[PDB]
Design a protein around this ligand. Sequence first.
Ligand SMILES: NC(=O)C1=CN([C@@H]2O[C@H](COP(=O)(O)OP(=O)(O)OC[C@H]3O[C@@H](n4cnc5c(N)ncnc54)[C@H](OP(=O)(O)O)[C@@H]3O)[C@@H](O)[C@H]2O)C=CC1
Ligand SMILES: NC(=O)C1=CN([C@@H]2O[C@H](COP(=O)(O)OP(=O)(O)OC[C@H]3O[C@@H](n4cnc5c(N)ncnc54)[C@H](OP(=O)(O)O)[C@@H]3O)[C@@H](O)[C@H]2O)C=CC1
Ligand SMILES: O=P(O)(O)Cc1ccc(-c2ccccc2)cn1
Ligand SMILES: O=P(O)(O)Cc1ccc(-c2ccccc2)cn1
Lengths: 398, 400
Amino acid sequence: GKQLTILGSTGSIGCSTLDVVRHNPEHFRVVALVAGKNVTRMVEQCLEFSPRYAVMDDEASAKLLKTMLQQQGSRTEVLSGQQAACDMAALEDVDQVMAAIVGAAGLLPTLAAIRAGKTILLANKESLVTCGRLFMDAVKQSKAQLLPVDSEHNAIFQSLPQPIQHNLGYADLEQNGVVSILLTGSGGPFRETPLRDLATMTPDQACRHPNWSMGRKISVDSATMMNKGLEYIEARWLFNASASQMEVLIHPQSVIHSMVRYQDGSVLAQLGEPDMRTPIAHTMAWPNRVNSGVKPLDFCKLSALTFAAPDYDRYPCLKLAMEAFEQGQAATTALNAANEITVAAFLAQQIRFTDIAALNLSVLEKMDMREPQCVDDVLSVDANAREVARKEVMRLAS
Amino acid sequence: GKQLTILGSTGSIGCSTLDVVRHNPEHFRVVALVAGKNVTRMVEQCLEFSPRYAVMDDEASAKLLKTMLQQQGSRTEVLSGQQAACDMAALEDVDQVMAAIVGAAGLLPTLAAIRAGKTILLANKESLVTCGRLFMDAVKQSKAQLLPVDSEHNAIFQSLPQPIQHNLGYADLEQNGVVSILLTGSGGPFRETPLRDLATMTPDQACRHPNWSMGRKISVDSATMMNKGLEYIEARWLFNASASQMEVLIHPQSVIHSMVRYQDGSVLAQLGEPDMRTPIAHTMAWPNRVNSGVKPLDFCKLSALTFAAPDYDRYPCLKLAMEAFEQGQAATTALNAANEITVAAFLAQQIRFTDIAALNLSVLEKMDMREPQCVDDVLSVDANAREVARKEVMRLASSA
Ligand SMILES: NC(=O)C1=CN([C@@H]2O[C@H](COP(=O)(O)OP(=O)(O)OC[C@H]3O[C@@H](n4cnc5c(N)ncnc54)[C@H](OP(=O)(O)O)[C@@H]3O)[C@@H](O)[C@H]2O)C=CC1
Ligand SMILES: NC(=O)C1=CN([C@@H]2O[C@H](COP(=O)(O)OP(=O)(O)OC[C@H]3O[C@@H](n4cnc5c(N)ncnc54)[C@H](OP(=O)(O)O)[C@@H]3O)[C@@H](O)[C@H]2O)C=CC1
Ligand SMILES: O=P(O)(O)Cc1ccc(-c2ccccc2)cn1
Ligand SMILES: O=P(O)(O)Cc1ccc(-c2ccccc2)cn1
């Protein structure tokens, strides 16, 4: 079947990927698993999927893993550190690399897979949010096939014509009859909150998305629409879309995952149950399909589907992201880094809900760095933006 | 430059297709126009599009047209009759044939295109409602490309993978990751009417689709969901779908035109403004795209989108169509034919709204014909079913 390396196997996307393989043991062979510190989950995955290699970024973790796998009678070879992670991404015999490491740490292993011309199941945000120019250049250079895993981008990918799907990132949209890309977002828990009350929203209220339940960081990003802002940045790189070829639409029910508008009037959309196994199984099977374990969407048990235009007075972060894109990878990197700092401060009750957007702006205004030319440059912008952001939080809470 | 024949150029689909040509004069050349009796419309189209040929099915119409064009200095050659219509569909240099003749009259001209291996932009309902097996067998033999123009089928086509699109009729759904085809219908004006009030609904009520504005016959078919039943028949042929691979959903807003359900849980859908130029331009440009004149769908000005399962007590015609399919082309042809007669009788106030389903069933029960083996056989089932249906109407309008 297809030989796969899973980068970030022990996290949420990694576990969902392995559930797809579990459903399709004849179509997929796990060659390598890479993770950080979750030795316990990693052991269980090595014992189920029999990979050739298992890598832990953390050395103490790698040593403990080796001792457990030995105790358990497994001969999976245990490696450690960043170079081994990149090596697994570049293994000559692997076909697909699930790029699911979180944060800047996913950058070099992902680039290693790109440079190796692998099919990349891309689920690491920083890759296009921070390194969109560098990675799209590298993809063109190696002819690597990117298959986006995030629900929105995968929905768009499924709704795009074949010549774009092949050649993803270099194809011309207009030449292929595409007018625009329609990014849909829930609008978050404060979609209908009076604007006066936004300054007093609590972390528990912000993380209380009506319908979904997910991590606190992403819940807050959904409340600010920073999440859609970051997906805007990725979509422009992934789909070769100009600002006029992008539309953002609030869709509270999140049944339509995103859409593509065509020259003749047609709009194609992908819909489905809210379950990451669907987009993951799509990318793993492309251009064919596999069972993912996700149940068929029941159209008779849906809330009525509604749409609205995002109000930038309600979602300044969405506008900030759009503007940042225009300023370049230094601005997008700085925004993403600043946002991690301000959201964490919000969750720690150091700042108010509305201070997230205000301090994100403040960081971008204060900085002005030059366009990154390599991953080290991006890492540098990221580090500097966090420091500026932390000082801003301290001043404010000071 | 794609060379085309337009069968039924003077009708609604015909006019919409020439608007697409008008918007894209450098991508499409009109070689031949074919119609029935609308000499006036035909004259204008010939002056504007300069086809090599124009045919009218009606002989006097063809004669009237021949002179007017010679007068206005048109170089188009005017022919007449069905054989001429079929020859246009088979012209060696023609790339695409827009199959937009209404009724049993569209069968032989559409078939001529299929036998010629043409790309067919299929609009004519009778082609697959009555000759589904014959026509799909024919397209498989000549490797003709079918491109469905009807909104539902076109939406499904656009939501299907490339291996199915390019082998439409022959490809296996399952092997291509497709679990089912989701056909959406508005549910008509009586979607929420008390069942016991259906018997008293008037033609004007049935034809007053709250949200849509179309011909009287189609409006009644929308009210009974016979329209969806006919499309179910077409879809099973066109997409090679078994009964378990078909779903019918009521979607009152008709924004989603139909959908395709995949193995991984994904559902692909096509949405757009309710303008036939969209699906027409889709088929004309496929696998590429062209401007159609249709404005982008404004998602901020929509009614909330809803869905529901059809209740067969409310829509017995839908269920009759599904059952007819299982009995073969003799049954689907008889149902289509009986429904023409019973809808016309309802509209003429000879029978009740609810007598349409009742009499359609009664015709089907009285018919006992073999599977048709060629178009002529289908025409005979049609002729016979019409007469059975007329007598049922008269029995009901006269006696008990
Ligand atoms: N969750 C979702 O619905 C979606 C998430 N995304 C993106 O996908 C990526 C992964 O998300 P998710 O799976 O939710 O995140 P998780 O935090 O659940 O998992 C992250 C994975 O990365 C591993 N990891 C962390 N640091 C390193 C490192 N230095 N080297 C190697 N592995 C490391 C973790 O290992 P361990 O736990 O063992 O320490 C874990 O396996 C993120 O970038 C996220 O933004 C995109 C689309 C959808
Ligand atoms: N209207 C719609 O939105 C849709 C319609 N369809 C189907 O497409 C087909 C065409 O529909 P529509 O355009 O609305 O129908 P119309 O009634 O508007 O047009 C019918 C066309 O066929 C011509 N015609 C009739 N008899 C003959 C004949 N014997 N030989 C040659 N031409 C003939 C008419 O010519 P003339 O007027 O000159 O006499 C006219 O050009 C129908 O089967 C319909 O069910 C499918 C999907 C959508
Ligand atoms: O689209 P966003 O807002 O960035 C994140 C998000 C939030 C909610 C949902 C959602 C999922 C299921 C039901 C209702 C809402 C999906 N994604
Ligand atoms: O799907 P049906 O019911 O057979 C025909 C039909 C009726 C109404 C509509 C419709 C179109 C636009 C707005 C509201 C309803 C579309 N098609």
